[PDB]
Amino acid sequence: LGGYVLGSAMSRPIIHFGSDYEDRYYRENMHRYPNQVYYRPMDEYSNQNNFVHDCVNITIKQHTVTTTTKGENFTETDVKMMERVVEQMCITQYERESQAY
């Protein structure tokens, strides 16, 4: 890791993405993204730009490697889709499991 401290938990950004997909995808999924950041404490060579380039790439990478059950990453809109899919599969398993017998 190194000299990078973890920024204290902050308010999540309001973003106006181009499309309705993103705007809504992001509405449903922001709880999945990091609420706080990993940055390098200020000194004399700290240009906003170097500071953010780092922070963005550490924060993300560290978020990437965190472990979690597949479920805590599931929205309502996922459950609707999953149980649609997994239904019609059992359905296939069914006729099959009785086609014989």
Add this chain to the structure above:
Amino acid sequence: GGYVLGSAMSRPIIHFGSDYEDRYYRENMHRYPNQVYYRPMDEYSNQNNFVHDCVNITIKQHTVTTTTKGENFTETDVKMMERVVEQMCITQYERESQAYYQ
């Protein structure tokens, strides 16, 4: 728990009604299971008793599987959260430097 996992089905092309759901599914569909756990027919199971049970577990068995965050994110989250985190880091620079010059 007595059930047995069958073999891998084809994940289907499902046209939901809306644009958001169709676009979503196309990108996320590889995230939901492709083979199912079921209680093989001794006798007593009618469709419902079966499919609703088969569904019941498969998901509750999926849910609890441990993965990683990065492993779950699609092309979109990747590109979407970098944009999220850029803003959040900009706010940290202004918090950070603000105090740095007192």
